[PDB]
Amino acid sequence: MRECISIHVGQAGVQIGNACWELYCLEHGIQPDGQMPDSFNTFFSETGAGKHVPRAVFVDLEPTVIDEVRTGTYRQLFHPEQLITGKEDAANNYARGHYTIGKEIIDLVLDRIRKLADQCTGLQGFLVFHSFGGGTGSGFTSLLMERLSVDYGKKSKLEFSIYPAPQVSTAVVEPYNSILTTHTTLEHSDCAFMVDNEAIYDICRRNLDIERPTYTNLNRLISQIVSSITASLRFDGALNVDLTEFQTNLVPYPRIHFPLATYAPVISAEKAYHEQLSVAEITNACFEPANQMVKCDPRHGKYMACCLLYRGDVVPKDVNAAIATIKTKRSIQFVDWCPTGFKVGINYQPPTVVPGGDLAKVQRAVCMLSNTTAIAEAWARLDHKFDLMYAKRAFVHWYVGEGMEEGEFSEAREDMAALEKDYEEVGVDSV
Amino acid sequence: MRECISIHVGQAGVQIGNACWELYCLEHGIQPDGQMPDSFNTFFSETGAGKHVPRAVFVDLEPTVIDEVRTGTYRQLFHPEQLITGKEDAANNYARGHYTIGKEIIDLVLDRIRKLADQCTGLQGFLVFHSFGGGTGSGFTSLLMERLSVDYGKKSKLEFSIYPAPQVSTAVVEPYNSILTTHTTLEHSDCAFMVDNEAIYDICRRNLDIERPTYTNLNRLISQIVSSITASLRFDGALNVDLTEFQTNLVPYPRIHFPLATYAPVISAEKAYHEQLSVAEITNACFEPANQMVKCDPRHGKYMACCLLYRGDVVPKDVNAAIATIKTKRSIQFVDWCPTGFKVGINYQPPTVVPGGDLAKVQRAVCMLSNTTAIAEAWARLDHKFDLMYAKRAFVHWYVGEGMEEGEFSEAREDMAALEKDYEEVGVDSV
Amino acid sequence: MREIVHIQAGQCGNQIGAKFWEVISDEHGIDPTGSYHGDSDLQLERINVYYNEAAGNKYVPRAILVDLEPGTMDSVRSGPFGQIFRPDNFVFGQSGAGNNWAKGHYTEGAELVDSVLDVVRKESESCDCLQGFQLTHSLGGGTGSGMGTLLISKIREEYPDRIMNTFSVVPSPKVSDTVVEPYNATLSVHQLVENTDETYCIDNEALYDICFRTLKLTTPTYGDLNHLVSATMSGVTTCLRFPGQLNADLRKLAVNMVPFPRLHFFMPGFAPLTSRGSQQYRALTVPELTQQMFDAKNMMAACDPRHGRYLTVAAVFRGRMSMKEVDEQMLNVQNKNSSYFVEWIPNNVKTAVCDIPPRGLKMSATFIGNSTAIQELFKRISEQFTAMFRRKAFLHWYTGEGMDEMEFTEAESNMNDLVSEYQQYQDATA
Amino acid sequence: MREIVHIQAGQCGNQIGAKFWEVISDEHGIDPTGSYHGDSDLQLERINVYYNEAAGNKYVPRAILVDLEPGTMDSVRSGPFGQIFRPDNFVFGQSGAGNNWAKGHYTEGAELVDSVLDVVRKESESCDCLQGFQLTHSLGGGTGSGMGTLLISKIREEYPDRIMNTFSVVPSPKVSDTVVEPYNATLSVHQLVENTDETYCIDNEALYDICFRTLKLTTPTYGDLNHLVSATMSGVTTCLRFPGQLNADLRKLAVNMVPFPRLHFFMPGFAPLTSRGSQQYRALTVPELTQQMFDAKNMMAACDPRHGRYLTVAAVFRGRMSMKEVDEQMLNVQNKNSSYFVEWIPNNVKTAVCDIPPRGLKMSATFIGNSTAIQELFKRISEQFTAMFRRKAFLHWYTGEGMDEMEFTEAESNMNDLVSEYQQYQDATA
Ligand SMILES: Nc1nc2c(ncn2[C@@H]2O[C@H](COP(=O)(O)OP(=O)(O)OP(=O)(O)O)[C@@H](O)[C@H]2O)c(=O)[nH]1
Ligand SMILES: Nc1nc2c(ncn2[C@@H]2O[C@H](COP(=O)(O)OP(=O)(O)OP(=O)(O)O)[C@@H](O)[C@H]2O)c(=O)[nH]1
Ligand SMILES: Nc1nc2c(ncn2[C@@H]2O[C@H](COP(=O)(O)OP(=O)(O)O)[C@@H](O)[C@H]2O)c(=O)[nH]1
Ligand SMILES: Nc1nc2c(ncn2[C@@H]2O[C@H](COP(=O)(O)OP(=O)(O)O)[C@@H](O)[C@H]2O)c(=O)[nH]1
Ligand SMILES: [Mg+2]
Ligand SMILES: [Mg+2]
């Protein structure tokens, strides 16, 4: 009665969803054969007799990644018609992923989304996994978000975008794609969480004592976060939450809907025996400056709204006491115009342990979603990188050669500068 | 031959009447089944063969107390149509208990009263038990008194109102209810005896050596007083008395009919064996300053007329000697304009010991009904409480919203001021 | 010939009348069955004075009992002599006076009076020469004072030539039984003065003293007090019912004892009153009886005889005794105590002697004194009346039944005038 | 006779109502099967108040459950007492308010309110004489504070003469679980002031303090807090369901506790709160209960009683105890703490006694206080509202559902006026 739809776009989005769905199947007990050996009605359609099929759509212009899914251990799970593939990657070109190739495939995707929407009832919202740096994850997602807002204006959209790392870089045109997609998505997406590859690398190496991390470990952490967000839907507990509640609590202004994500109890098995992992200890970890999954200094900016999603055997009295201590810290600076900045959600189901993951079993777990002004530094950095390359007009001809206009680049820059100004204005205290 | 009718209105009235009828049944030898295994004709109608029925009408807007009576040990005694219950209680709202709801039950109550009156001859008068504090016992009592005075102008009405205690109170609108009911009933009742809960509590602690007295003992004492009052109508004896004699002797002026009841021989069993309980000692006890049933200082006001209702083996010479000794007392100051202070009534029947009562068997017993001017202090205290609460129209909107104007409050206040002035005037000596 | 009817009004009136008929029946030897069983023949010689013969030799008293409440009648009807009275005589009301004189004289008494007068006429025709009416009365109450006064006025109108005697209980000086006792007393005497022919004022306070001081009683009930009054009533009429060496009569008593029409209030007294323990230590003789009769403390009225000179004194002796001894005693009393008698009356003592003594006594006497000392009693009532009337206390009850302040003011004028008359002759000098 | 219809709205409302019906069924001995299995017929003597008889001796609660999300309804259904509720009463939406008051009062609540009102009428017209409505909701949330407010307005429009009681949970001062809690609270109270007749304020911080400091608990879940609130409601309503020496009523409490129309916010309290370890040490007596009730730290509201004088205080005792001790304790409280009451109210204590104590307790008392200290909570809420509203934080969500700034300003003005009235009455003297 509260079905939610998840859409995975681009290589990074598809791979994250692959780990994400591996988590859901383990949680509810759903076998890879999709034959459960209620709660699962919020994600899986009970098609046929004795079988469940997830409400997911996988779309990628390059057929390589999705072809790996069809050959993977989860072949029989997904609906074969739900996996849509192109025949040529966007090649990190935003125009190709939005204008040239994106036009050919968008019609088929909207057909699949409408099919799922009619099948489901009481639709909650959309989950979109995509990447800023890439072209398919940026150009196609902007195209998809523009379409859905027109067709589903009354429903909320949630994104989990791979925010570009400050020092670590993979594509030379990451600043270009990120600026373009943000301008085109700022007016459509209700609330988009951002995570950095670099920040997760430090967390993986430090807390988990992992010498050589890979994307498998990184994506599993993301899966744990998205599991916590949807926990209140897939399970019942004290003080439940809904996706519509996230939009209200975490978005003071329409143009500021970029909250961070954080998972507090991230420890290895070799270190779990000694740690107490108390509610107070867990909540302290969630606010650790080095424990944020975005490479930004939280102390260099005010907090505006933080949502805590506890999991497991957690007593609300412990949460109330732990919250009070956090509010009394002098370093943790909240905006004066927001007296109460905590939206607390609790659930009874503890996190499950991935058989191959590096995370040990924990009786309690929280996920912190904080809307903070610290990202103003992050926005400035990407904005600055955009300005340097565009000054020489480098790499512009590739975009121009696929239907773009040069003036559009300035407009995206102009809007991005406005966004940075808006963050600064909000960060100012009252008089 | 000499019929009398008892009407119990409100919770306090109903419970006191229950105790009084238990006392009457014990006194006349009438079993609770109504068949006793003349004297009884003054109160019970011998309807049918071998069955007697009390001449009582129980009225209460809240059906809880009357329902408890129906399920009580006296179920098969009262006539089923004699018990009249409303649907919603007055809830301490005088307007509700007089205007809004009383109009829906007054017709049935008057019909039952007319049936009882037509079923008897030589009707002496009416006995009404009610509380000055509650809503039903005030508004319904005033309405019923007005109706009876309209329809039975030649008869006498007697009330036993539970006057509010000075320092002890239970309802916040007790001053409002008391002032309103006094204003409405001062022109209809012929003589209204009054008692205070605080004074009876003090008597129970000091004399009975009881430290946790409930309402049962208080109601039993009140029943003893009522039985002493009505003894002359039920048993032969030297110097009998009647209710008309009470009205003639105890009411010097039309608006000064507020005597104080008093029961002299109130001792416990453990203390009875050490006292002779002679007539002189009993009479002296009846005038003890700390032995009145109303929390008023008798020495602060002149007596006007005191009626003594003796019981048991009493020699009239002892009564005359005790009266002379009382008249010789300087502290007991009578009004100089009433030389014949006392009205004396004797009866052969001694008091009866309640099986579970805390009073010990006594060979002699008297009841003192004194019309003293000290009651002006209590009237002034209640008037001051009313003035303080009404000074800012507190707790007024309830009365306003039930078809009652504000000017009635002012008229009642003026009438109470006039009553206090009349008491003060009467207090003045004669030249 | 010379038959006397008996009327009882009010609770006190009926209570006294019960014992009066008990003692009369004891004197005439009539059991509660109403059948004669006595031994002396002289008892039945004049039994028609109080009784009417009936079938089967049954005798019933010529008595009428009136009340406004059935409470007293039931006790009388259930008493030892309840079956003696004819049931038709038991006339009673329902509402009751409730000590309100106006209620007992104007409202409740107005309805019941016609029935009683019908019974009065029915009883009167049963005789041939009606001697006079006898009423037992209470001034303090409402039924007695109200109805009894109203009944007196009606009878006086119907029988102007016959004498009416009232034995009214007067309120005590110190002890008061009702709050409005002064009101009822003044209203009643307003009419008793101008209507009755001989009234024997009696006070409960004096009776209590006699029971205590003389009889040495510790628990004097109302039964004993009424017995003393009853003995007095029997002594007055014993001259009619029996022969004697010097026989008087009721009319012969009124002539001697009433110098003037307005002055007929008497203070009765009984001679042989002795306690049980002192019976053997005191000699029963004429001088012993005479000393007791003139004893100041022996008067059944609360007044002090020493405070006022006697106008006339009638002593009615009973039993066989020499006239010489009786006459000498009276001469000594009038000589030794000459300061206590009016000089303008040459001889004050009227003597009546009867042969048969009371039941069980060797001899006895009855004292009836017309003393001006009773003026003190009246002025006390007037004083109490005035204090309660200046502030108009309790007047709304009387005015509510049809009375008026005019009646009260008129009543006090009659009382003050009566007090003036008593003081006039008390100060009068030859 | 005198039936009460119970309405549960919002997640907190349903969570409280589950425990409320659990404890009520425990009192009346109604098993989760819905069939009576108790041992005291007095429970069934007044079971009509909360239940309707059915075929086969079945009884069902007269409850109506309202929500905008089916999760809470499904959780309740799986509960031990899910089967006793009539399934037709379960009314629930699909979209869910999502903590947005505007959505819970204009967009989702508007569509769903018709079914709720239809069920309300069906339940009400099935009773002979309706006593009043009771609502359990939360001010902080969206569904609660919007749907309950709209339903209260509709019912007040439909039933002007009845009384509506709301046991609303107020936001805690230091610990807040929602970001738009001040907005929701102000918008809800704007109508709660003008619509409801008696509102009981509950703060989770005070409940935590009671659970830890007094009850000596270490892991207090929401079950214990909801149980405390349910026990308070049962103590409030026990006067109707059982006899007693002084039986009160909901309207009786409304008349005794509300001096002026806009001041009807109370701070309830439960007297016998002791931990398991200290069960033997404390003596259970009326003075002990009275001392616990007036304890500063034992108030379920976050306000400090010492910061303002009470207007009126109602204490509803339960069990068999002497009235003398109760009134003596009340007099002692008014004497010692005379500085904590308004001088212009002579007597401030309303006392009710019932003969049926709560299950497992010899005696108990339920506290109800109309203290002026709630102005502190109101001004704290107003300050938070102003701080958020100066920069129009989160306003676009409300304006997206049809709301406007004018309503926010009007609600803030009404709250400020209420605070001003409270302060004025706290300040004014005789
Ligand atoms: N956290 C995480 N990040 C990934 C993963 N795979 C790729 N990325 C990051 O996502 C960014 C975007 O790369 P792609 O997703 O391949 O770009 P695209 O959407 O496929 O568009 P194309 O360039 O046409 O392939 C890269 O720079 C990577 O750093 C992954 O598995 N986990
Ligand atoms: N002495 C005595 N007083 C009682 C008793 N029961 C109640 N009262 C008094 O009655 C007062 C309250 O008035 P109630 O009679 O209860 O009210 P009511 O007449 O039923 O009208 P409502 O307020 O609508 O219930 C209290 O202040 C008590 O003092 C009792 O058993 N004995
Ligand atoms: N001697 C005597 N006096 C009585 C008796 N009963 C009543 N009294 C007197 O009568 C007075 C009461 O008046 P009462 O006749 O009863 O009032 P009534 O019935 O309205 O006429 C009291 O002052 C008593 O002193 C009695 O038995 N004997
Ligand atoms: N005492 C108590 N309070 C609760 C419980 N559950 C939720 N709450 C309160 O309700 C508030 C959440 O509002 P909620 O009703 O869930 O939002 P809504 O569904 O939109 O009305 C929080 O501030 C909690 O303090 C509970 O079980 N017990
Ligand atoms: Mg790709
Ligand atoms: Mg009542």
Numbering used by the authors:
A (entry chain C), B (entry chain A): 1 to 37, 47 to 440
C (entry chain D), D (entry chain B): 1 to 430
What sentences appear in the manuscript?
MT-associated protein 7 (MAP7) has the unusual ability of both MT binding and activating kinesin-1-mediated cargo transport along MTs. Microtubules (MTs) are key components of the eukaryotic cytoskeleton and are essential for intracellular organization, organelle trafficking and mitosis. MT-associated proteins (MAPs) interact with MTs, regulate their dynamics, and mediate MT functions in physiological contexts through sophisticated regulation.
To improve the occupancy of MAP7 MTBD on the MT lattice, additional MAP7 MTBD was therefore added to MAP7 MTBD-nucleated MTs adsorbed on the grid before vitrification. Following imaging and processing of these MTs, the symmetrized 3D reconstruction of MAP7 MTBD bound MT had an overall resolution of 3.3 Å and revealed improved MAP7 MTBD density lying along the protofilament, and offset ~20 Å from its centre. The helical nature of MAP7 MTBD is also evident from the reconstruction density, albeit at slightly lower local resolution (~4 Å) compared to the MT. Individual MAP7 MTBD side chains however, could not be discriminated in the helical density, probably due to a number of factors including sub-stoichiometric MT binding and as a result of the dynamic nature of the MT-MTBD interaction. To facilitate interpretation of our reconstruction, we used AlphaFold 2 multimer to predict the structure of MAP7 MTBD (residues 59–170) bound to a tubulin dimer. However, since the exact register of the MAP7 MTBD cannot be confirmed based on cryo-EM density alone, we truncated our MAP7 MTBD to include only its helical backbone together with 4 tubulin monomers, including the central α/β-tubulin dimer18. Additional C-terminal residues Val437-Val440 for α-tubulin and residues Ala428-Ala430 for β-tubulin were therefore also modelled guided by the density. The ordering of these usually disordered residues could be a result of an interaction between the tubulin CTTs and MAP7; however, this interaction is not directly visible in our reconstruction and is presumably not well ordered. MAP7 MTBD forms a 130 Å long helix from around residue R66 to residue E148 and binds MTs along the protofilament as confirmed by cryo-EM.
